[PDB]
XYZ file of C-alpha atoms in Angstrom:
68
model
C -3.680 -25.296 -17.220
C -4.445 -21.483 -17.698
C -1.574 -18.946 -16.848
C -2.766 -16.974 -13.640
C -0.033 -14.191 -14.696
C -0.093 -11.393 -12.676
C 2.444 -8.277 -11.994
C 5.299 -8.356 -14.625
C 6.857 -5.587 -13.067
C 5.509 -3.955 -10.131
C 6.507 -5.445 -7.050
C 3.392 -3.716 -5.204
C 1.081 -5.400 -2.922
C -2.295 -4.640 -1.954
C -4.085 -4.385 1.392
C -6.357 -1.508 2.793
C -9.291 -0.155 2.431
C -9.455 3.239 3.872
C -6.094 4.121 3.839
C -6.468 5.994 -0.077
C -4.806 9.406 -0.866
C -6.157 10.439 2.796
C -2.998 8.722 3.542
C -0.491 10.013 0.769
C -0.564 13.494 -0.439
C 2.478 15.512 0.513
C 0.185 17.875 3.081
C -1.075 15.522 5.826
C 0.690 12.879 8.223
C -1.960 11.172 9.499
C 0.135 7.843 9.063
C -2.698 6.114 8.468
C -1.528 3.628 5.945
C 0.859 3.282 8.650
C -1.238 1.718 11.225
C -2.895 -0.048 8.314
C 0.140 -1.396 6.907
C 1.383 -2.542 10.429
C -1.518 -5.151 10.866
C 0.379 -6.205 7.121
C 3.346 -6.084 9.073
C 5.862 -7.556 6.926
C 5.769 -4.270 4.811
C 8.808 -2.094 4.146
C 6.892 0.193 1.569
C 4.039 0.283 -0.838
C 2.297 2.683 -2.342
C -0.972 5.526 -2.231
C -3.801 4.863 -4.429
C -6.157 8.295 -5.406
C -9.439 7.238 -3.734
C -10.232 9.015 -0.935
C -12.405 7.109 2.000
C -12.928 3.878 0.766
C -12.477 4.388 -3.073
C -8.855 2.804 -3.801
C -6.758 0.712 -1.190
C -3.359 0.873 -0.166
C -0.347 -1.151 -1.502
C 2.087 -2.603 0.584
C 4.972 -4.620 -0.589
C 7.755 -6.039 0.744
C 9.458 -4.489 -2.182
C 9.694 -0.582 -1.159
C 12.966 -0.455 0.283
C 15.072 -2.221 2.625
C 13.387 -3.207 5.735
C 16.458 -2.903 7.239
C-alpha cells in the first residue's frame, strides 16, 4: 500500500473558507475565524492564511496552545 504521508511537522489543521487574512492581520478584530473556528469547535489555535475573501482558508488545530 502507498504511504498517504502528510504533515511531518506542522500540527495545523484546516477548515474555513472565508476566514483568510480578513481574519489575521494585527489591525482588525473582526474575530471572524473565531466564529468560524467555533463551528470546528474542538480548536485551541490555528493559524491565518494570506487570501483575502475566499482565496486561502483558515487552520485550526488542536495544537495551538492549551485549551485549557
Amino acid at each position: 500500500c502507498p504511504e498517504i504521508e502528510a504533515q511531518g511537522n506542522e500540527c495545523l489543521k484546516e477548515y474555513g473558507g472565508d476566514v483568510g487574512f480578513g481574519f489575521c492581520a494585527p489591525r482588525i478584530f473582526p474575530t471572524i475565524c473565531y466564529t468560524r473556528c467555533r463551528e470546528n469547535k474542538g480548536a485551541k489555535g490555528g493559524r491565518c492564511r494570506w487570501g483575502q475573501g475566499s482565496n486561502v482558508k483558515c487552520l485550526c488545530d488542536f495544537c495551538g496552545d492549551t485549551p485549557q
